[model samples]
Target: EKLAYQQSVEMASNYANQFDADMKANLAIARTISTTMESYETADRDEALLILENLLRDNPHLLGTYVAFEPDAFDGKDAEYTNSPAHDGTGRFVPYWNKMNGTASVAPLLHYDSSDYYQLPKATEKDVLTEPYFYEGVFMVSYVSPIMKEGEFAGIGGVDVSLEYVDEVVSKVRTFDTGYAFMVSNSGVILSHPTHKDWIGKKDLYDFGGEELEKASRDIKNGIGGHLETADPTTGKTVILFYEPVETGDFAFVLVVPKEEMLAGVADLRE
Candidate 1:
Protein backbone atom coordinates (compact mmCIF):
# COMPACT_ATOMS: atom_id res chain seq x y z
CA GLU A 1 0.00 0.00 0.00
CA LYS A 2 2.85 2.37 0.73
CA LEU A 3 4.29 1.40 -2.63
CA ALA A 4 0.96 2.11 -4.27
CA TYR A 5 0.82 5.50 -2.57
CA GLN A 6 4.33 6.27 -3.77
CA GLN A 7 3.43 5.27 -7.30
CA SER A 8 0.37 7.48 -7.33
CA VAL A 9 2.33 10.49 -6.13
CA GLU A 10 4.98 9.85 -8.77
CA MET A 11 2.35 9.64 -11.48
CA ALA A 12 0.76 12.90 -10.33
CA SER A 13 4.08 14.69 -10.52
CA ASN A 14 4.72 13.21 -13.95
CA TYR A 15 1.42 14.53 -15.24
CA ALA A 16 2.17 17.94 -13.78
CA ASN A 17 5.58 17.98 -15.44
CA GLN A 18 4.08 17.06 -18.77
CA PHE A 19 1.63 19.95 -18.48
CA ASP A 20 4.44 22.32 -17.58
CA ALA A 21 6.56 21.22 -20.50
CA ASP A 22 3.69 21.43 -22.94
CA MET A 23 2.72 24.96 -21.86
CA LYS A 24 6.27 26.31 -21.92
CA ALA A 25 6.97 24.72 -25.29
CA ASN A 26 3.90 26.38 -26.72
CA LEU A 27 4.69 29.65 -24.92
CA ALA A 28 8.07 29.77 -26.61
CA ILE A 29 6.27 29.58 -29.91
CA ALA A 30 3.97 32.42 -28.83
CA ARG A 31 6.88 34.56 -27.66
CA THR A 32 8.73 34.17 -30.92
CA ILE A 33 5.67 35.27 -32.82
CA SER A 34 5.21 38.35 -30.61
CA THR A 35 8.87 39.34 -30.73
CA THR A 36 9.07 39.04 -34.51
CA MET A 37 5.82 40.90 -34.98
CA GLU A 38 7.33 43.92 -33.29
CA SER A 39 9.66 44.43 -36.24
CA TYR A 40 6.81 45.51 -38.50
CA GLU A 41 5.12 48.88 -38.13
CA THR A 42 1.95 48.83 -36.03
CA ALA A 43 -0.19 49.76 -39.05
CA ASP A 44 1.12 46.93 -41.18
CA ARG A 45 -1.76 44.47 -40.81
CA ASP A 46 -0.78 42.42 -43.81
CA GLU A 47 2.71 41.78 -42.48
CA ALA A 48 1.38 41.00 -39.02
CA LEU A 49 -1.25 38.67 -40.42
CA LEU A 50 1.39 37.02 -42.55
CA ILE A 51 3.52 36.26 -39.51
CA LEU A 52 0.51 35.02 -37.50
CA GLU A 53 -0.52 32.72 -40.31
CA ASN A 54 2.93 31.20 -40.32
CA LEU A 55 2.62 30.53 -36.60
CA LEU A 56 -0.79 29.00 -37.23
CA ARG A 57 0.87 26.62 -39.66
CA ASP A 58 3.36 25.56 -37.04
CA ASN A 59 1.13 24.69 -34.05
CA PRO A 60 -1.85 22.45 -34.59
CA HIS A 61 -2.81 22.20 -30.94
CA LEU A 62 -3.54 25.89 -30.66
CA LEU A 63 -7.21 26.79 -30.48
CA GLY A 64 -6.18 29.78 -32.59
CA THR A 65 -3.47 32.33 -33.23
CA TYR A 66 -4.13 36.04 -32.84
CA VAL A 67 -2.85 39.62 -32.72
CA ALA A 68 -4.39 42.56 -30.88
CA PHE A 69 -2.87 46.01 -31.35
CA GLU A 70 -2.94 49.01 -29.06
CA PRO A 71 -5.46 51.74 -29.62
CA ASP A 72 -4.79 53.71 -32.81
CA ALA A 73 -1.93 51.34 -33.54
CA PHE A 74 -3.77 50.38 -36.66
CA ASP A 75 -5.54 53.58 -37.60
CA GLY A 76 -9.18 53.17 -38.73
CA LYS A 77 -9.00 49.40 -38.31
CA ASP A 78 -10.16 47.10 -35.54
CA ALA A 79 -6.98 46.15 -33.72
CA GLU A 80 -7.37 42.37 -33.60
CA TYR A 81 -7.45 39.32 -35.84
CA THR A 82 -8.00 35.74 -34.64
CA ASN A 83 -7.57 32.65 -36.80
CA SER A 84 -8.98 29.38 -35.49
CA PRO A 85 -9.79 26.02 -36.97
CA ALA A 86 -13.18 26.04 -38.62
CA HIS A 87 -15.81 23.61 -37.48
CA ASP A 88 -18.24 22.29 -40.06
CA GLY A 89 -20.65 20.53 -37.67
CA THR A 90 -19.04 17.36 -38.94
CA GLY A 91 -16.87 14.86 -37.09
CA ARG A 92 -13.69 16.52 -38.34
CA PHE A 93 -13.00 20.22 -38.63
CA VAL A 94 -11.88 20.88 -42.20
CA PRO A 95 -10.56 24.29 -43.10
CA TYR A 96 -9.44 25.94 -46.28
CA TRP A 97 -5.81 25.76 -47.37
CA ASN A 98 -3.83 29.02 -47.63
CA LYS A 99 -6.66 30.74 -45.79
CA MET A 100 -6.35 30.92 -42.05
CA ASN A 101 -8.84 28.41 -40.68
CA GLY A 102 -11.74 29.27 -38.44
CA THR A 103 -15.38 30.25 -38.30
CA ALA A 104 -14.89 33.43 -40.26
CA SER A 105 -14.32 34.31 -43.93
CA VAL A 106 -11.74 36.76 -42.64
CA ALA A 107 -10.93 36.75 -38.97
CA PRO A 108 -12.79 39.49 -37.18
CA LEU A 109 -11.06 42.40 -35.54
CA LEU A 110 -11.73 43.40 -31.92
CA HIS A 111 -11.31 46.55 -29.92
CA TYR A 112 -8.40 46.40 -27.49
CA ASP A 113 -9.82 48.83 -24.96
CA SER A 114 -12.30 46.33 -23.52
CA SER A 115 -10.77 42.92 -24.14
CA ASP A 116 -8.84 41.03 -21.45
CA TYR A 117 -5.88 40.26 -23.75
CA TYR A 118 -5.26 43.95 -24.36
CA GLN A 119 -6.56 45.49 -21.15
CA LEU A 120 -4.68 43.27 -18.70
CA PRO A 121 -1.34 43.46 -20.50
CA LYS A 122 -1.60 47.19 -21.05
CA ALA A 123 -2.73 47.86 -17.49
CA THR A 124 -0.30 45.48 -15.83
CA GLU A 125 2.48 45.89 -18.41
CA LYS A 126 2.73 42.11 -18.25
CA ASP A 127 3.51 39.75 -21.09
CA VAL A 128 0.82 37.10 -20.68
CA LEU A 129 -2.92 37.64 -21.14
CA THR A 130 -5.06 34.98 -19.55
CA GLU A 131 -8.75 34.95 -20.37
CA PRO A 132 -10.29 35.50 -16.95
CA TYR A 133 -13.71 34.14 -17.77
CA PHE A 134 -15.49 31.54 -19.83
CA TYR A 135 -16.41 32.73 -23.28
CA GLU A 136 -19.79 31.49 -24.48
CA GLY A 137 -19.48 28.51 -22.11
CA VAL A 138 -15.98 27.50 -23.32
CA PHE A 139 -12.97 28.49 -21.29
CA MET A 140 -9.61 29.44 -22.82
CA VAL A 141 -6.25 30.70 -21.70
CA SER A 142 -4.05 32.69 -24.06
CA TYR A 143 -0.37 33.53 -23.99
CA VAL A 144 -0.09 37.02 -25.45
CA SER A 145 3.39 38.53 -25.48
CA PRO A 146 3.64 42.28 -25.24
CA ILE A 147 4.80 44.44 -28.13
CA MET A 148 6.31 47.85 -27.63
CA LYS A 149 7.28 50.47 -30.19
CA GLU A 150 8.61 54.02 -29.72
CA GLY A 151 8.56 53.61 -25.92
CA GLU A 152 4.87 52.76 -25.83
CA PHE A 153 2.70 49.70 -26.16
CA ALA A 154 2.34 48.72 -29.84
CA GLY A 155 0.29 45.51 -29.57
CA ILE A 156 0.33 41.86 -28.55
CA GLY A 157 0.35 38.45 -30.24
CA GLY A 158 0.16 34.83 -29.20
CA VAL A 159 -1.81 31.55 -29.10
CA ASP A 160 -5.00 30.59 -27.33
CA VAL A 161 -5.00 27.11 -25.77
CA SER A 162 -8.18 25.36 -24.75
CA LEU A 163 -8.64 24.45 -21.10
CA GLU A 164 -10.10 21.19 -22.36
CA TYR A 165 -6.59 20.16 -23.28
CA VAL A 166 -5.43 20.75 -19.71
CA ASP A 167 -8.53 19.07 -18.33
CA GLU A 168 -7.93 16.06 -20.52
CA VAL A 169 -4.44 15.76 -19.12
CA VAL A 170 -5.58 16.04 -15.51
CA SER A 171 -8.41 13.58 -16.02
CA LYS A 172 -5.97 10.78 -16.77
CA VAL A 173 -4.24 10.93 -13.38
CA ARG A 174 -6.07 8.68 -10.94
CA THR A 175 -5.76 6.89 -7.57
CA PHE A 176 -7.93 3.78 -7.59
CA ASP A 177 -11.54 4.43 -8.69
CA THR A 178 -12.73 6.86 -6.00
CA GLY A 179 -9.69 9.16 -5.91
CA TYR A 180 -9.32 12.01 -8.40
CA ALA A 181 -6.91 14.68 -9.60
CA PHE A 182 -7.22 18.42 -10.17
CA MET A 183 -5.09 21.53 -10.57
CA VAL A 184 -5.08 25.04 -9.15
CA SER A 185 -3.28 28.31 -9.60
CA ASN A 186 -0.71 29.58 -7.10
CA SER A 187 -3.41 31.87 -5.74
CA GLY A 188 -5.81 28.98 -5.05
CA VAL A 189 -7.89 29.43 -8.14
CA ILE A 190 -9.07 26.09 -9.49
CA LEU A 191 -7.77 25.21 -12.95
CA SER A 192 -9.03 21.73 -13.79
CA HIS A 193 -11.12 18.93 -12.29
CA PRO A 194 -12.95 15.83 -13.53
CA THR A 195 -16.40 16.28 -12.04
CA HIS A 196 -16.41 19.95 -11.10
CA LYS A 197 -16.86 21.67 -14.41
CA ASP A 198 -18.20 24.95 -13.02
CA TRP A 199 -15.26 25.34 -10.70
CA ILE A 200 -12.77 25.71 -13.49
CA GLY A 201 -11.87 29.36 -13.95
CA LYS A 202 -14.65 30.18 -11.51
CA LYS A 203 -14.03 28.94 -7.95
CA ASP A 204 -11.02 29.34 -5.76
CA LEU A 205 -10.01 26.35 -3.71
CA TYR A 206 -9.43 28.62 -0.74
CA ASP A 207 -13.11 29.60 -0.71
CA PHE A 208 -14.55 26.12 -0.89
CA GLY A 209 -15.74 23.78 1.92
CA GLY A 210 -14.34 23.04 5.40
CA GLU A 211 -11.48 24.44 7.43
CA GLU A 212 -9.13 21.56 6.63
CA LEU A 213 -9.67 22.00 2.94
CA GLU A 214 -9.10 25.71 3.39
CA LYS A 215 -5.80 25.08 5.09
CA ALA A 216 -4.88 22.59 2.42
CA SER A 217 -5.76 25.19 -0.16
CA ARG A 218 -3.46 27.69 1.49
CA ASP A 219 -0.65 25.16 1.64
CA ILE A 220 -1.06 24.38 -2.02
CA LYS A 221 -1.27 28.08 -2.87
CA ASN A 222 1.93 28.75 -0.96
CA GLY A 223 3.70 25.95 -2.88
CA ILE A 224 4.14 23.83 0.22
CA GLY A 225 2.48 20.68 -1.04
CA GLY A 226 2.66 17.03 0.02
CA HIS A 227 0.51 14.36 1.56
CA LEU A 228 -1.96 15.80 4.05
CA GLU A 229 -4.83 14.08 5.83
CA THR A 230 -7.95 16.20 5.64
CA ALA A 231 -11.68 15.69 5.69
CA ASP A 232 -13.12 15.61 2.20
CA PRO A 233 -15.58 18.44 1.78
CA THR A 234 -17.92 16.45 -0.41
CA THR A 235 -18.28 13.42 1.84
CA GLY A 236 -16.71 14.23 5.22
CA LYS A 237 -14.49 11.15 4.92
CA THR A 238 -10.85 11.58 5.81
CA VAL A 239 -8.78 11.85 2.66
CA ILE A 240 -5.10 12.01 1.97
CA LEU A 241 -4.43 14.61 -0.70
CA PHE A 242 -1.12 14.82 -2.51
CA TYR A 243 0.07 17.88 -4.33
CA GLU A 244 3.15 19.12 -6.16
CA PRO A 245 3.97 22.18 -8.23
CA VAL A 246 3.89 22.16 -11.96
CA GLU A 247 7.34 23.16 -13.22
CA THR A 248 6.51 25.76 -15.88
CA GLY A 249 4.44 28.05 -13.68
CA ASP A 250 2.95 28.74 -10.26
CA PHE A 251 0.38 25.96 -10.40
CA ALA A 252 -0.04 22.74 -8.44
CA PHE A 253 -1.35 19.35 -9.47
CA VAL A 254 -3.32 17.76 -6.62
CA LEU A 255 -4.42 14.17 -6.20
CA VAL A 256 -6.99 13.24 -3.58
CA VAL A 257 -7.35 9.66 -2.33
CA PRO A 258 -9.90 8.55 0.21
CA LYS A 259 -8.37 7.04 3.33
CA GLU A 260 -10.70 4.06 3.31
CA GLU A 261 -9.91 3.11 -0.26
CA MET A 262 -6.17 3.52 0.35
CA LEU A 263 -6.09 1.82 3.75
CA ALA A 264 -8.59 -1.00 3.34
CA GLY A 265 -5.91 -3.71 3.14
CA VAL A 266 -4.11 -2.26 6.10
CA ALA A 267 -7.34 -2.35 8.12
CA ASP A 268 -7.81 -5.99 7.11
CA LEU A 269 -4.27 -6.79 8.34
CA ARG A 270 -5.05 -5.09 11.68
CA GLU A 271 -8.27 -7.11 11.96
Candidate 2:
Protein backbone atom coordinates (compact mmCIF):
# COMPACT_ATOMS: atom_id res chain seq x y z
CA GLU A 1 0.00 0.00 0.00
CA LYS A 2 1.54 3.29 -1.13
CA LEU A 3 0.49 5.86 1.38
CA ALA A 4 0.44 9.43 0.03
CA TYR A 5 1.62 11.32 3.09
CA GLN A 6 3.53 10.56 6.25
CA GLN A 7 1.50 9.96 9.36
CA SER A 8 2.07 11.69 12.72
CA VAL A 9 4.75 10.18 14.98
CA GLU A 10 4.93 9.44 18.70
CA MET A 11 8.12 8.57 20.58
CA ALA A 12 6.84 6.47 23.44
CA SER A 13 8.78 7.37 26.55
CA ASN A 14 7.51 3.99 27.65
CA TYR A 15 10.33 2.21 25.77
CA ALA A 16 13.10 4.10 27.54
CA ASN A 17 11.32 3.60 30.82
CA GLN A 18 11.18 -0.10 30.02
CA PHE A 19 14.88 -0.19 29.07
CA ASP A 20 15.82 1.37 32.41
CA ALA A 21 13.82 -1.28 34.21
CA ASP A 22 15.62 -4.07 32.30
CA MET A 23 19.03 -2.62 33.16
CA LYS A 24 18.12 -2.47 36.82
CA ALA A 25 16.97 -6.06 36.96
CA ASN A 26 19.91 -7.50 35.04
CA LEU A 27 22.51 -5.63 37.12
CA ALA A 28 20.91 -6.75 40.34
CA ILE A 29 21.62 -10.33 39.26
CA ALA A 30 25.31 -9.54 38.66
CA ARG A 31 25.76 -7.75 42.00
CA THR A 32 24.46 -10.81 43.79
CA ILE A 33 26.96 -13.13 42.07
CA SER A 34 29.81 -10.71 42.82
CA THR A 35 28.97 -10.75 46.54
CA THR A 36 28.82 -14.50 46.88
CA MET A 37 31.70 -15.66 44.66
CA GLU A 38 34.41 -14.06 46.81
CA SER A 39 34.91 -17.06 49.10
CA TYR A 40 34.96 -19.46 46.23
CA GLU A 41 38.35 -18.17 45.08
CA THR A 42 40.34 -20.60 47.21
CA ALA A 43 38.56 -23.39 45.41
CA ASP A 44 39.10 -24.38 41.79
CA ARG A 45 38.33 -21.80 39.09
CA ASP A 46 37.81 -24.76 36.80
CA GLU A 47 35.12 -25.93 39.20
CA ALA A 48 33.51 -22.54 39.19
CA LEU A 49 33.68 -22.36 35.43
CA LEU A 50 32.18 -25.78 35.25
CA ILE A 51 29.42 -24.76 37.60
CA LEU A 52 28.68 -21.66 35.56
CA GLU A 53 28.90 -23.71 32.41
CA ASN A 54 26.29 -26.12 33.66
CA LEU A 55 23.96 -23.76 35.48
CA LEU A 56 23.97 -21.02 32.90
CA ARG A 57 24.22 -23.22 29.85
CA ASP A 58 20.49 -23.09 29.30
CA ASN A 59 20.85 -19.36 28.85
CA PRO A 60 23.88 -19.62 26.60
CA HIS A 61 22.85 -16.29 25.17
CA LEU A 62 24.27 -14.49 28.22
CA LEU A 63 27.76 -15.96 28.05
CA GLY A 64 30.73 -13.63 27.46
CA THR A 65 28.96 -10.93 29.43
CA TYR A 66 30.21 -11.31 33.03
CA VAL A 67 33.80 -10.33 33.89
CA ALA A 68 35.01 -11.05 37.45
CA PHE A 69 38.20 -9.91 39.18
CA GLU A 70 39.90 -11.29 42.27
CA PRO A 71 41.81 -8.63 44.23
CA ASP A 72 44.24 -10.64 46.40
CA ALA A 73 45.11 -12.95 43.52
CA PHE A 74 48.40 -13.02 41.62
CA ASP A 75 49.28 -9.98 39.52
CA GLY A 76 51.97 -11.74 37.52
CA LYS A 77 52.71 -10.46 34.04
CA ASP A 78 51.60 -12.66 31.13
CA ALA A 79 55.12 -13.52 30.00
CA GLU A 80 56.48 -13.70 33.55
CA TYR A 81 53.96 -16.40 34.38
CA THR A 82 54.17 -18.04 30.94
CA ASN A 83 50.52 -17.22 30.55
CA SER A 84 48.65 -17.01 27.27
CA PRO A 85 49.42 -13.65 25.62
CA ALA A 86 45.72 -13.20 25.16
CA HIS A 87 45.25 -12.81 28.93
CA ASP A 88 48.84 -11.76 29.67
CA GLY A 89 48.64 -8.00 29.13
CA THR A 90 45.65 -7.82 31.46
CA GLY A 91 46.52 -8.85 34.99
CA ARG A 92 42.84 -9.57 35.62
CA PHE A 93 43.08 -13.25 34.77
CA VAL A 94 44.47 -15.19 37.68
CA PRO A 95 43.99 -18.18 39.97
CA TYR A 96 40.95 -16.34 41.30
CA TRP A 97 38.41 -15.79 38.53
CA ASN A 98 37.96 -17.59 35.22
CA LYS A 99 36.78 -15.52 32.26
CA MET A 100 34.02 -16.78 30.03
CA ASN A 101 34.68 -16.63 26.30
CA GLY A 102 38.31 -16.17 27.39
CA THR A 103 39.20 -15.10 23.87
CA ALA A 104 36.97 -12.04 24.01
CA SER A 105 38.17 -8.74 25.53
CA VAL A 106 35.36 -7.13 27.47
CA ALA A 107 37.17 -5.08 30.03
CA PRO A 108 39.47 -8.02 30.79
CA LEU A 109 41.53 -5.64 32.84
CA LEU A 110 40.90 -4.35 36.35
CA HIS A 111 37.58 -4.50 38.13
CA TYR A 112 35.40 -1.53 37.28
CA ASP A 113 34.61 0.05 40.65
CA SER A 114 34.27 3.35 38.90
CA SER A 115 31.26 3.13 36.60
CA ASP A 116 28.15 4.98 35.51
CA TYR A 117 26.22 2.17 37.15
CA TYR A 118 25.74 3.63 40.59
CA GLN A 119 25.70 7.09 42.16
CA LEU A 120 28.87 8.29 43.91
CA PRO A 121 29.38 7.41 47.59
CA LYS A 122 25.98 5.74 47.54
CA ALA A 123 28.02 3.36 45.40
CA THR A 124 31.02 2.59 47.58
CA GLU A 125 34.56 2.39 46.23
CA LYS A 126 34.11 -1.36 45.95
CA ASP A 127 30.85 -1.33 44.07
CA VAL A 128 31.62 -3.43 40.98
CA LEU A 129 30.83 -2.31 37.45
CA THR A 130 28.63 -4.21 35.02
CA GLU A 131 26.58 -1.79 33.06
CA PRO A 132 27.93 0.92 30.82
CA TYR A 133 30.74 -1.51 30.00
CA PHE A 134 31.65 -2.72 26.55
CA TYR A 135 31.35 -6.50 26.57
CA GLU A 136 31.91 -9.26 23.98
CA GLY A 137 32.16 -6.53 21.32
CA VAL A 138 28.95 -4.60 21.46
CA PHE A 139 28.24 -1.75 23.84
CA MET A 140 26.54 -3.23 26.91
CA VAL A 141 25.16 -2.47 30.36
CA SER A 142 25.55 -5.10 33.11
CA TYR A 143 24.91 -6.28 36.66
CA VAL A 144 27.96 -6.18 38.94
CA SER A 145 29.17 -6.07 42.55
CA PRO A 146 32.33 -6.72 44.54
CA ILE A 147 33.28 -9.98 46.19
CA MET A 148 34.41 -9.14 49.68
CA LYS A 149 36.13 -11.03 52.49
CA GLU A 150 36.45 -10.27 56.23
CA GLY A 151 36.15 -6.51 55.56
CA GLU A 152 38.62 -6.55 52.68
CA PHE A 153 38.00 -6.70 48.93
CA ALA A 154 37.99 -10.19 47.54
CA GLY A 155 37.08 -9.60 43.92
CA ILE A 156 34.48 -8.19 41.53
CA GLY A 157 31.59 -10.22 40.12
CA GLY A 158 28.92 -9.45 37.52
CA VAL A 159 26.66 -10.61 34.68
CA ASP A 160 26.65 -9.63 31.01
CA VAL A 161 23.34 -9.22 29.21
CA SER A 162 23.20 -8.35 25.54
CA LEU A 163 21.20 -5.24 24.73
CA GLU A 164 19.72 -7.39 22.00
CA TYR A 165 18.10 -9.51 24.67
CA VAL A 166 16.83 -6.40 26.34
CA ASP A 167 15.67 -5.22 22.97
CA GLU A 168 13.93 -8.51 22.44
CA VAL A 169 12.40 -8.32 25.87
CA VAL A 170 11.39 -4.76 25.16
CA SER A 171 10.08 -5.85 21.79
CA LYS A 172 7.91 -8.44 23.48
CA VAL A 173 7.02 -6.59 26.71
CA ARG A 174 5.22 -4.00 24.65
CA THR A 175 3.36 -3.87 21.37
CA PHE A 176 5.18 -2.02 18.58
CA ASP A 177 6.11 -4.36 15.73
CA THR A 178 5.39 -1.93 12.90
CA GLY A 179 7.42 0.45 15.13
CA TYR A 180 11.14 0.22 15.99
CA ALA A 181 13.66 0.35 18.84
CA PHE A 182 17.30 1.48 19.01
CA MET A 183 20.00 1.85 21.65
CA VAL A 184 22.77 4.03 20.30
CA SER A 185 25.89 5.67 21.62
CA ASN A 186 26.15 9.38 22.34
CA SER A 187 28.02 9.55 19.04
CA GLY A 188 24.96 8.03 17.31
CA VAL A 189 26.04 4.48 16.46
CA ILE A 190 23.16 2.03 16.20
CA LEU A 191 23.29 -0.72 18.88
CA SER A 192 20.21 -2.80 18.12
CA HIS A 193 17.17 -2.74 15.85
CA PRO A 194 13.74 -4.10 14.88
CA THR A 195 13.72 -2.64 11.41
CA HIS A 196 16.54 -2.02 8.95
CA LYS A 197 19.79 -3.97 9.09
CA ASP A 198 21.60 -1.74 11.62
CA TRP A 199 25.31 -2.31 11.76
CA ILE A 200 26.47 -3.36 15.23
CA GLY A 201 29.04 -0.58 15.45
CA LYS A 202 29.37 2.37 13.05
CA LYS A 203 27.37 5.16 11.53
CA ASP A 204 25.98 8.20 13.28
CA LEU A 205 22.18 8.30 12.90
CA TYR A 206 21.95 11.80 14.36
CA ASP A 207 23.65 13.27 11.30
CA PHE A 208 21.02 13.80 8.62
CA GLY A 209 23.77 14.71 6.11
CA GLY A 210 23.32 18.44 5.40
CA GLU A 211 23.69 21.57 7.50
CA GLU A 212 20.98 21.32 10.12
CA LEU A 213 20.20 22.60 13.59
CA GLU A 214 23.61 23.27 15.16
CA LYS A 215 22.24 24.56 18.46
CA ALA A 216 19.91 21.58 18.82
CA SER A 217 22.65 19.10 17.98
CA ARG A 218 24.89 20.74 20.57
CA ASP A 219 22.14 20.35 23.15
CA ILE A 220 21.85 16.68 22.21
CA LYS A 221 25.60 16.33 22.63
CA ASN A 222 25.14 17.61 26.16
CA GLY A 223 23.25 14.29 26.59
CA ILE A 224 20.25 15.28 28.60
CA GLY A 225 17.48 12.66 28.31
CA GLY A 226 14.30 13.38 26.41
CA HIS A 227 11.95 12.19 23.66
CA LEU A 228 10.74 13.57 20.34
CA GLU A 229 7.65 12.98 18.19
CA THR A 230 8.56 13.50 14.58
CA ALA A 231 8.27 12.15 11.04
CA ASP A 232 10.11 9.01 9.85
CA PRO A 233 11.29 9.30 6.28
CA THR A 234 11.72 5.53 6.12
CA THR A 235 8.09 4.64 6.78
CA GLY A 236 6.52 7.95 5.81
CA LYS A 237 4.76 7.79 9.19
CA THR A 238 5.04 9.89 12.30
CA VAL A 239 7.88 8.62 14.54
CA ILE A 240 8.18 8.75 18.26
CA LEU A 241 11.81 9.00 19.34
CA PHE A 242 11.78 8.05 23.00
CA TYR A 243 15.13 8.45 24.71
CA GLU A 244 16.87 8.92 28.08
CA PRO A 245 20.41 9.65 29.34
CA VAL A 246 21.78 7.04 31.67
CA GLU A 247 23.32 8.00 35.04
CA THR A 248 26.75 9.42 34.19
CA GLY A 249 26.22 7.11 31.22
CA ASP A 250 27.25 7.49 27.59
CA PHE A 251 24.36 5.60 26.00
CA ALA A 252 20.91 6.56 24.75
CA PHE A 253 17.94 4.32 23.90
CA VAL A 254 15.45 5.56 21.35
CA LEU A 255 12.14 3.84 20.50
CA VAL A 256 10.56 5.02 17.26
CA VAL A 257 7.00 3.73 16.92
CA PRO A 258 4.54 4.86 14.33
CA LYS A 259 1.70 6.82 15.91
CA GLU A 260 -1.09 5.17 13.99
CA GLU A 261 0.10 1.68 14.81
CA MET A 262 1.27 2.78 18.24
CA LEU A 263 -2.23 3.85 19.17
CA ALA A 264 -4.07 1.23 17.24
CA GLY A 265 -5.31 -1.37 19.70
CA VAL A 266 -5.19 -3.95 16.92
CA ALA A 267 -1.45 -3.63 16.40
CA ASP A 268 -0.80 -3.08 20.10
CA LEU A 269 -2.45 -6.40 20.99
CA ARG A 270 -1.30 -8.38 17.96
CA GLU A 271 2.07 -9.45 19.25
Of the candidates shown, which would achieve the greatest lDDT relative to the real structure? 1
Q: Please report, as a residue range, the 10-residue window in candidate 2 with the lowest summed lDDT.
A: 1-10
RMSD to truth, every model: 6.8, 7.8
lDDT of each: 0.64, 0.47
Output the TM-score of candidate 2. 0.55
For candidate 1, the 10 contiguous residues with the lowest summed lDDT are 88-97
lDDT for residue 140 in candidate 2, whole number 0-100: 56
Question: RMSD to the native, candidate 1?
Answer: 6.8
Clashes of each: 0, 10
Candidate 2, 1-271: lDDT as tens digits:
1121122112334455555565565556656555557556454444645544443454454644343444324232333433442233444443222234444333343324455433221246455333334533545554556555667654555555655655565444334557656666555555565554345444455543322323323434566555555667454566555555433234566656566764563444545
lDDT of 1 by residue, 81-172 (tens): 32333222221211211222343232443434576766777776667636334544456666767767666777676677766767777777
Over 4 Å off, model 1: 1-9, 41-43, 74-106, 109-111, 129-132, 264-271
For model 1, state the Cα shift of residue 72 in Å: 2.8
